[PDB]
Amino acid sequence: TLTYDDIVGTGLANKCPTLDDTARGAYPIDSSQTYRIARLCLQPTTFLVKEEPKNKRQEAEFVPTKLVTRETTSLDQIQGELKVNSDGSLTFVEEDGIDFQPVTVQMAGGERIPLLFTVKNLVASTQPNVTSITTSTDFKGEFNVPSYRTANFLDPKGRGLASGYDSAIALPQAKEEELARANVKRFSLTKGQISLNVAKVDGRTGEIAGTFESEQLSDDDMGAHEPHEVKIQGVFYASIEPA
Amino acid sequence: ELVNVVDEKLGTAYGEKIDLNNTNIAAFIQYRGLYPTLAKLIVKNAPYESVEDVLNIPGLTERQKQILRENLEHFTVTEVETALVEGGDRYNNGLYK
Amino acid sequence: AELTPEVLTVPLNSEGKTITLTEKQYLEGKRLFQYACASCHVGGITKTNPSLDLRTETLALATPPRDNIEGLVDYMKNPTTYDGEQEIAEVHPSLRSADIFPKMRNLTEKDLVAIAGHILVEPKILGDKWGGGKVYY
Amino acid sequence: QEINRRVQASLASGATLEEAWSAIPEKLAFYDYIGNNPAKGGLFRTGPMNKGDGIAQAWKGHAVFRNKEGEELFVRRMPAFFESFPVILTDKNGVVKADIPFRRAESKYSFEQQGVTVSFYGGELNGQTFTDPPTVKSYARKAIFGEIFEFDTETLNSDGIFRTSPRG
Amino acid sequence: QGMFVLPFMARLGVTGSWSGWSITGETGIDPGFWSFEGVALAHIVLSGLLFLAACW
Numbered sequence: 248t249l250t251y252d253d254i255v256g257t258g259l260a261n262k263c264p265t266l267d268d269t270a271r272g273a274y275p276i277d278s279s280q281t282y283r284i285a286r287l288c289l290q291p292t293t294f295l296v297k298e299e300p301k302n303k304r305q306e307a308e309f310v311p312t313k314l315v316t317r318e319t320t321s322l323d324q325i326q327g328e329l330k331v332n333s334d335g336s337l338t339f340v341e342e343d344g345i346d347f348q349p350v351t352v353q354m355a356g357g358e359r360i361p362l363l364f365t366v367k368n369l370v371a372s373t374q375p376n377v378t379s380i381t382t383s384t385d386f387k388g389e390f391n392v393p394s395y396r397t398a399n400f401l402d403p404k405g406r407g408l409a410s411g412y413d414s415a416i417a418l419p420q421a422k423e424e425e426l427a428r429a430n431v432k433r434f435s436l437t438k439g440q441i442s443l444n445v446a447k448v449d450g451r452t453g454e455i456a457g458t459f460e461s462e463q464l465s466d467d468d469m470g471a472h473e474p475h476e477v478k479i480q481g482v483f484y485a486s487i488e489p490a
Numbered sequence: 491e492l493v494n495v496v497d498e499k500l501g502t503a504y505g506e507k508i509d510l511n512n513t514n515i516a517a518f519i520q521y522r523g524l525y526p527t528l529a530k531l532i533v534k535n536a537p538y539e540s541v542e543d544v545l546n547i548p549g550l551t552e553r554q555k556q557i558l559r560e561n562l563e564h565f566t567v568t569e570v571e572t573a574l575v576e577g578g579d580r581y582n583n584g585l586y587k
Numbered sequence: 588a589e590l591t592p593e594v595l596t597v598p599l600n601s602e603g604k605t606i607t608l609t610e611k612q613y614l615e616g617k618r619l620f621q622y623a624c625a626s627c628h629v630g631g632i633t634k635t636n637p638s639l640d641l642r643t644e645t646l647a648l649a650t651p652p653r654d655n656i657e658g659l660v661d662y663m664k665n666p667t668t669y670d671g672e673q674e675i676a677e678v679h680p681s682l683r684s685a686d687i688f689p690k691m692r693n694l695t696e697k698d699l700v701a702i703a704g705h706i707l708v709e710p711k712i713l714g715d716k717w718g719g720g721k722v723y724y
Numbered sequence: 725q726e727i728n729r730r731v732q733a734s735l736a737s738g739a740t741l742e743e744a745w746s747a748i749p750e751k752l753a754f755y756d757y758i759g760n761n762p763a764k765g766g767l768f769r770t771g772p773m774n775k776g777d778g779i780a781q782a783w784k785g786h787a788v789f790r791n792k793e794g795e796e797l798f799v800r801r802m803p804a805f806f807e808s809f810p811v812i813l814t815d816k817n818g819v820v821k822a823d824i825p826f827r828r829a830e831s832k833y834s835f836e837q838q839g840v841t842v843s844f845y846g847g848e849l850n851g852q853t854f855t856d857p858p859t860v861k862s863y864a865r866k867a868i869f870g871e872i873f874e875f876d877t878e879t880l881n882s883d884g885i886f887r888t889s890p891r892g
Numbered sequence: 893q894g895m896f897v898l899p900f901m902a903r904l905g906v907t908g909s910w911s912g913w914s915i916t917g918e919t920g921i922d923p924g925f926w927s928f929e930g931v932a933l934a935h936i937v938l939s940g941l942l943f944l945a946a947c948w
């Protein structure tokens with residue numbers, strides 16, 4: 248068993264727990280019992296950004312990016328109710344945890360794409376008739392994506408939403424119409440989608456692990472510009488418990 | 491047409507009273523008996539369709555119900571403004587002294 | 588302006604009684620406040636919780652009311668949250684927690700009376716500055 | 725001071741507010757504007773004043789601010805020292821009634837809370853009233869500069885930053 | 893785009909930038925050192941060494 252001093256500075260703190268290859272079992276679900284996820288962890292391994300289509304209007308693809316904010320990207324210590332529904336499907340309702348990380352990735356050509364990688368208010372459900380969580384189980388769900396910056400955030404000229412100037416004070420007599428989009432901060436709230444594909448199960452401990460893919464918008468800098476579409480891929484871990 | 495939603499919200503009852511759905515928790519210090527216990531329950535159980543719905547919060551004492559009734563005149567409700575409630579800003583809005 | 592007896596006259600209780608503090612009492616109050624309180628309450632604010640200050644109106648709206656000598660002395664013996672609901676001696680300096688807050692150990696009843704007096708008189712002098720924080724420095 | 729004197733003299737001779745303010749010459753109103761103050765420029769802000777605030781076209785008229793109770797409110801003017809200045813409205817006696825808050829969370833004086841409105845007398849906007857808070861704020865922001873003018877900012881690609889005059 | 897030396901770099905196989913793009917429209921390529929930037933830098937350093945040799 249490892250301590251903080253074993254892990255500190257190694258990068259392991261940003262990694263989700265894994266399960267060995269022998270963990271291909273099944274975790275029995277009792278539709279009479281209540282369940283919870285005690286710890287959900289999401290460790291992104293790849294960030295893809297949808298290229299802004301030239302104007303050919305064909306299929307714009309997701310392209311690779313380089314992480315520049317280091318090992319600060321993982322979601323963890325997430326907990327929430329695991330409902331057993333009438334139809335035998337399971338629904339995870341996220342209640343709390345470290346369920347967001349700001350992330351900046353860099354596109355070919357230098358363009359930096361900040362995003363609020365998140366699963367805030369995640370609601371994800373399995374297929375019906377899940378008597379046991381197996382390596383065939385998956386969760387599909389949606390979550391909220393709030394503004395990358397919150398309402399107090401001030402831009403470099405001191406303008407903000409819940410705080411700040413409401414004009415370009417360095418340009419006292421500039422016509423205000425053309426600066427409106429910059430002057431008037433707006434708070435974004437959009438929806439994201441995530442798939443959790445279970446690859447490993449310890450039927451005894453109640454630990455599951457696998458891969459995820461999520462899709463969400465990036466930062467729109469409080470309404471100053473259009474967000475990019477981001478696809479996040481990685482691995483996850485969850486501990487399921489009687490509660 | 492671009493609008494600052496917080497400034498706009500100041501033109502509603504939000505600007506005249508404690509909005510149970512939006513106002514930061516420190517505002518409950520303005521009146522006797524609301525902070526921190528009732529303040530916490532109120533913020534935790536938001537949003538409310540009406541002011542009087544604050545009375546239905548589970549586990550409240552009779553004394554608590556009394557204080558709430560005495561202070562309903564100081565409360566309001568408007569639509570939840572994402573900008574004011576995200577980031578946990580209702581618990582800490584970056585304002586101190 | 589001067590530190591008149593009128594200025595040093597503060598509510599003793601919620602029932603309309605006042606006490607007139609002596610100049611020595613006021614200076615002692617300032618001294619003891621600096622000693623036991625100012626680490627957190629410099630200028631009337633609260634560094635570990637700026638939401639609650641020591642302004643008279645605020646103390647007045649606390650439960651039980653704290654805008655008088657008896658209330659403040661009681662707070663110094665048995666501190667509560669602003670609504671009076673939980674006792675907080677365990678994380679707040681008091682005679683009751685003088686074991687874990689050693690600077691309270693030698694505070695006398697007279698000392699507490701002095702501190703309370705400083706707390707109520709200061710705003711009558713400094714106005715908005717008291718509990719005002721950096722805005723009013 | 726001279727503008728107010730003339731307006732008062734007009735009102736005392738039985739003019740309406742509209743008539744009184746419309747009688748104020750545009751040139752006089754134009755003198756009562758900080759963009760013509762020679763102490764508002766910059767060493768490397770080069771060229772004519774028009775390159776900054778624009779080519780003045782017309783006086784919009786005098787802006788009168790009022791709260792929901794109907795009390796007249798007065799915008800605190802920018803002193804020459806300040807590159808930028810807050811927007812603060814007081815009553816006739818200097819008591820604060822309205823402002824543009826920086827932090828909103830404990831705002832008590834927002835134009836929206838105070839239902840601030842603006843009515844124009846004289847100039848292009850004579851007889852018009854605005855009540856929607858964005859526009860009222862916009863005019864208050866211009867009111868910090870004194871009398872409010874319409875500018876051609878396109879002709880010279882004006883950048884909106886005050887420049888000094890040949891006096892300066 | 894009025895590019896003059898870029899096509900000559902491309903002609904002999906320099907097609908990518910250190911910043912990750914390539915002139916064929918690929919993304920997330922590693923051109924190694926000999927990107928357009930690497931070629932330019934190499935020429936600048938060469939310029940300097942030739943200057944010193946000229947002095948000698």
Ligand code: CLA
Nearest residue numbers: 766767768769770771772773774775887888889890891892
């Ligand atoms: C008394 C001298 C004087 C004055 C007061 C003016 C003033 C005016 N002229 Mg004018 N001008 C002048 C001489 C003067 N000019 C001369 C001699 C010429 C011929 C070159 C011109 C040519 C001219 C033109 C072509 C134009 C003007 C315009 C204008 C106006 C714009 C001012 C401006 O933007 O300056 C900007 C001033 C500066 C940026 C300050 C310069 C400071 C220098 C660079 C400092 C140098 C430091 C030094 C190197 C340090 C040495 C250190 C060493 C000892 C160790 C303005 C009303 C313009 C106008 O709007 O016309 C309609 C316009 O278009 N001027």
Ligand code: HEM
Nearest residue numbers: 623624627635636639640645646649662663667668669680
């Ligand atoms: C003799 C010493 C002190 C006295 C007399 C004093 C006085 C007071 C009073 C009267 C209040 C009630 C505020 C109100 O109702 O508006 C208060 C609140 C508070 N003070 Fe003190 N103060 C002292 C020292 C300290 C110290 C040393 C700390 C921190 C280390 C501290 C932290 C706090 C906190 C956290 C609160 C509010 C707690 C809550 O309501 O949850 N105080 N103080």
Ligand SMILES: CC1=C(/C=C/C(C)=C/C=C/C(C)=C/C=C/C=C(C)/C=C/C=C(C)/C=C/C2=C(C)CCCC2(C)C)C(C)(C)CCC1
Nearest residue numbers: 893894895896897936939940941942943944945946947948
């Ligand atoms: C503005 C202009 C622009 C730009 C221009 C340019 C950019 C130019 C540059 C170019 C240059 C940049 C030139 C080059 C050069 C060089 C020279 C001509 C010099 C020389 C040599 C020599 C003289 C040296 C000597 C030496 C010494 C040093 C040492 C020892 C040895 C010897 C003696 C050899 C354009 C046109 C686009 C357009 C229009 C305008």
Ligand SMILES: CC1=C(/C=C/C(C)=C/C=CC(/C)=C/C=C/C=C(C)/C=C/C=C(C)/C=C/C2=C(C)CCCC2(C)C)C(C)(C)CCC1
Nearest residue numbers: 925926934935937938939940941942943944945946947948
């Ligand atoms: C092979 C290799 C390469 C090629 C390379 C090149 C091409 C080289 C060149 C080199 C160079 C090109 C060098 C230069 C030189 C010389 C030197 C080493 C320097 C010098 C001199 C000096 C010593 C001077 C001194 C002084 C002066 C400073 C001044 C006056 C006085 C005197 C003169 C004294 C590549 C990349 C392709 C890749 C891989 C392979």
Ligand SMILES: [Ca+2]
Nearest residue numbers: 382383445446
């Ligand atoms: Ca699977």
Ligand SMILES: [Ca+2]
Nearest residue numbers: 877878881882
């Ligand atoms: Ca322009």
Ligand SMILES: [Cl-]
Nearest residue numbers: 519638640645
């Ligand atoms: Cl306060």
